[PDB]
Amino acid sequence: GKPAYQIYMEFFQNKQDDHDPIDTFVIQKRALLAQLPSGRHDEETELDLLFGLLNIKYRKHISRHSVHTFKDLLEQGRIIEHN
Amino acid sequence: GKPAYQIYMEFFQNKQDDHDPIDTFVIQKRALLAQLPSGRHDEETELDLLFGLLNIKYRKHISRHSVHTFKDLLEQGRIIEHN
C-alpha cells in the first residue's frame, strides 16, 4: 500500500466542504485510516485526527468531547443535517 | 493543554518553507507532538506524521524509508543544507 506519511498528508489535505454529507466525508477519511498499519491508532485517536477537518457547520453544534465513537459523530451529524 | 484534534490541525497546517532550516522546523513540529497524550505515538509514527510536511528540498534526497529516527533525519538534512 501507500506509505503512511502519504496517507497522513492526503487525509489532512482536504477539509469537509459545504456540499459534502458527513456520512460520505467520514467514509472517505476512514478509508484512508484503514490503510495505516493495523492496530496503530485507536478510535479516540482516529476521531482526534478527523475532527478538525469537519465543516464548521457540524463543529458549531458538536464539540469533540461530546462524541466518543464514529457512530456517535455520524448520529449527531445526521440530525444536524436535518435540524 | 490544547485538545488533540487542534494540535493535529496545527501540525498539518504549515509545511516547511524554503527559508526554514530543518532543525527549527523539526523543533516546532516536535513541540506540537509533545502536547499529544504521552505514549500515544511511537517515533516511527511521529516521523510518518512529519515527513510529508518537509520541504521537497529534503525529500528529493531523503526518502522516508531511509531514516528510522529523528536523529537520522536531522543528521542527513543538515548535510543536505551544506551539500
UniProtKB/Swiss-Prot annotation, chains A, B:
Disruption phenotype: Strong reduction in the number of synaptic boutons at neuromuscular junction in third-instar larvae. Expressed in a specific population of brain neurons, named E347, that are necessary and sufficient for proper body fat storage. It comes from the Eukaryota. Induction: Up-regulated following stimulation of E347 brain neurons. It is found in: Extracellular vesicle membrane; Synapse. Belongs to the ARC/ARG3.1 family. Homooligomer; homooligomerizes into virion-like capsids. The protein is evolutionarily related to retrotransposon Gag proteins. It contains structural elements found within viral Gag polyproteins originated from the Ty3/gypsy retrotransposon family and retains the ability to form virion-like capsid structures that can mediate mRNA transfer between cells. Tetrapod and fly Arc protein-coding genes originated independently from distinct lineages of Ty3/gypsy retrotransposons. Master regulator of synaptic plasticity that self-assembles into virion-like capsids that encapsulate RNAs and mediate intercellular RNA transfer from motorneurons to muscles. Arc1 protein is released from motorneurons in extracellular vesicles that mediate the transfer of Arc1 mRNA into muscle cells, where Arc1 mRNA can undergo activity-dependent translation. Intercellular transfer od Arc1 mRNA is required for synaptic plasticity at the neuromuscular junction. This is Activity-regulated cytoskeleton associated protein 1. It comes from Drosophila melanogaster (Fruit fly).
